[PDB]
Amino acid sequence: DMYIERAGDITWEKDAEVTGNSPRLDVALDESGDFSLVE
């Protein structure tokens, strides 16, 4: 059986760890909801 536990509030926090890049990808989405790269 599955159960839930609260982990926090949904709030934007100023000065949080700024990381990650912004790539533009060619993708495909199948009937099963899985993404794949199109090249």
Partner 1 sequence: GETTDGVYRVMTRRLLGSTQVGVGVMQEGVFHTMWHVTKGAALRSGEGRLDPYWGDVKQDLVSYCGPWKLDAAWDGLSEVQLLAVPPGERAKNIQTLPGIFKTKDGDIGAVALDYPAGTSGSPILDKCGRVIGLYGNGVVIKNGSYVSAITQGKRE
Three-class SS state of 23: coil
CB of 25 to partner 1, least distance (A): 6
Q: Please note each residue after which the chain is broken, C-to-N distance over 2.5 A, or write none.
A: none
Binding mask 1-39 for partner 1 (x = CB under 8 A): xxxxxxxxxxxxx--xxxxxxxxxxxxxx-xxx-xxx--
CB of 39 to partner 1, least distance (A): 9
CA distance 39 to 26: 7
Q: Residues interacting with partner 1, by CB under 8 A?
A: 1-13, 16-29, 31-33, 35-37
